[PDB]
Amino acid sequence: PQFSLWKRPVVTAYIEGQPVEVLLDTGADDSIVAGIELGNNYSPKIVGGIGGFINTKEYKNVEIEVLNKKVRATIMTGDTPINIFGRNILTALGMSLNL
Amino acid sequence: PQFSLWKRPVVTAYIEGQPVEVLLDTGADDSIVAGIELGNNYSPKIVGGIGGFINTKEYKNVEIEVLNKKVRATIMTGDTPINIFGRNILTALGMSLNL
């Protein structure tokens, strides 16, 4: 798998078996997805980026399948406009950014 | 150059001679830098991030020096909390995401 970055590197992931399109993002430390409910056992966190801050819910040991691999990783849920898989998941997948 | 993503893929660069710390961000379409002054030859643009929208000043054909390369690229200046080189510069440098 190689993403040449001429388009957004976006793929299909399954989170707790629910399909979501996600952006593979080296500029994000963590991962954030909208439109899925992961339940009542979370820790509330605030994240900031361009345009401001949002409230998130942090969930640990969540089942994720992406790029033909299955991993358990930390996921935040929140009103993000796009679903982001940040470096915590990219490293669990063994991905690298190369020049 | 390989970035293994266990730490942020941050480097230093020069933008028309001005030193900056920048994050290599596959999740950004554009490149946005705060604080530097590129002058009055710009067009306003509107950029959307995780928290909403900001106005930016768009400068074309800007010289930038990064990773021992010299390219000319479009830079936007505006209120980002982290300077980011997005896919317009990553593709100019020939970078890719690999698994």
Ligand SMILES: CC(C)CN(C[C@@H](O)[C@H](Cc1ccccc1)NC(=O)O[C@H]1CCOC1)S(=O)(=O)c1ccc(N)cc1
């Ligand atoms: C801005 C960086 C430093 C951090 N952001 C990641 C970036 O890749 C961010 C991802 C994104 C793309 C499109 C819309 C909304 C978000 N791209 C981004 O804003 O693109 C803009 C600026 C130029 O072109 C368009 S983040 O989303 O705020 C963020 C922060 C913390 C966590 N844990 C996760 C995400």
Ligand SMILES: [Cl-]
């Ligand atoms: Cl290389």
Ligand SMILES: [Cl-]
């Ligand atoms: Cl690393």
Ligand SMILES: [Cl-]
């Ligand atoms: Cl490291």
Ligand SMILES: [Cl-]
């Ligand atoms: Cl390292």
Ligand SMILES: [Cl-]
């Ligand atoms: Cl210089």
Ligand SMILES: [Cl-]
């Ligand atoms: Cl854009």
Ligand SMILES: [Cl-]
């Ligand atoms: Cl615009």
Ligand SMILES: [Cl-]
């Ligand atoms: Cl934009």
Ligand code: NA
């Ligand atoms: Na609980």
Ligand SMILES: [Zn+2]
């Ligand atoms: Zn499956």
Ligand SMILES: [Zn+2]
């Ligand atoms: Zn909303």
Ligand SMILES: [Zn+2]
């Ligand atoms: Zn490292």
Ligand SMILES: [Zn+2]
């Ligand atoms: Zn120079």
Ligand SMILES: [Zn+2]
């Ligand atoms: Zn730093």
Ligand SMILES: [Zn+2]
């Ligand atoms: Zn844009």
